[PDB]
Amino acid sequence: GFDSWHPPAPGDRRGPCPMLNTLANHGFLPHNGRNITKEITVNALNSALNVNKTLGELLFNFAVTTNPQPNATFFDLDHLSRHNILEHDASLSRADYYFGHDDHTFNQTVFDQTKSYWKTPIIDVQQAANARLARVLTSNATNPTFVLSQIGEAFSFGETAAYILALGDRVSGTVPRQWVEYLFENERLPLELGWRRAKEVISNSDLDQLTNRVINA
Numbered sequence: 001g002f003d004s005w006h007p008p009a010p011g012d013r014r015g016p017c018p019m020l021n022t023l024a025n026h027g028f029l030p031h032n033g034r035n036i037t038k039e040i041t042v043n044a045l046n047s048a049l050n051v052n053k054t055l056g057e058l059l060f061n062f063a064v065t066t067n068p069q070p071n072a073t074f075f076d077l078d079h080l081s082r083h084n085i086l087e088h089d090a091s092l093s094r095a096d097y098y099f100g101h102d103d104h105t106f107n108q109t110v111f112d113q114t115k116s117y118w119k120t121p122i123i124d125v126q127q128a129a130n131a132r133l134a135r136v137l138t139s140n141a142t143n144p145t146f147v148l149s150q151i152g153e154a155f156s157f158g159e160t161a162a163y164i165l166a167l168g169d170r171v172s173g174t175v176p177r178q179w180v181e182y183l184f185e186n187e188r189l190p191l192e193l194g195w196r197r198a199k200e201v202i203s204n205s206d207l208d209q210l211t212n213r214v215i216n217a
């Protein structure tokens, strides 16, 4: 829960999502990142972040498509790392698969580029959109195998909306820069800096409206 945290050990699976990695480190998800079921996913997202259980189920249904095992009713966090299923190029904190065949390890050089677009202590929708676009332009210019499919692009917009929605204020569309940086660089919730679990339930409609604002910006 909120009061426990420890880093992954050998055998603990981690993937390309900073938030799922964080929730496993806290034990909201199994700390070993394995055998994650619909019920575990829905309960972890609701307990930790106040994600609507309907949204949590939809996200699980995406996640489970990455498990290579036939007829799987679970996923492990490293299944999410399979290139161009849910994972995609032009991430904010991971390298493109092309360069070193590692699209899952946190990459400080990549993240430093993203952070350079967060110029003020509060991130707004415009700065969030700039950071993501800069990553797309950089991958496009440097990765000869760069692809951002229609679905990958929709995912990319949704991921930027997600850190605003889970950590910040969905009406103003703002979030403290330090909390987002803390999440990515520590894979721990920024509780000591004052972050509180969202008091309003986070539903599909909330994610949709914020995603569309990032697109419009």
Ligand code: HEM
Residues within 6 Å of the ligand: 016, 017, 018, 019, 020, 041, 045, 049, 059, 060, 062, 063, 080, 081, 086, 087, 088, 089, 090, 091, 092, 093, 094, 159, 160, 162, 163, 166, 167
């Ligand atoms: C079951 C639920 C979830 C699943 C299956 C999932 C899956 C993923 C995957 C596969 C990626 C990699 C995409 C890429 O290539 O960049 C990713 C990235 C990301 N996810 Fe999650 N995610 C979930 C929940 C969340 C939540 C609740 C948040 C709230 C903060 C979140 C925030 C992010 C962010 C900000 C990224 C971008 C990472 C980057 O660009 O480096 N995710 N997620």
Ligand SMILES: [Mg+2]
Residues within 6 Å of the ligand: 016, 087, 088, 089, 090, 091, 094, 095, 096, 103
């Ligand atoms: Mg990626």
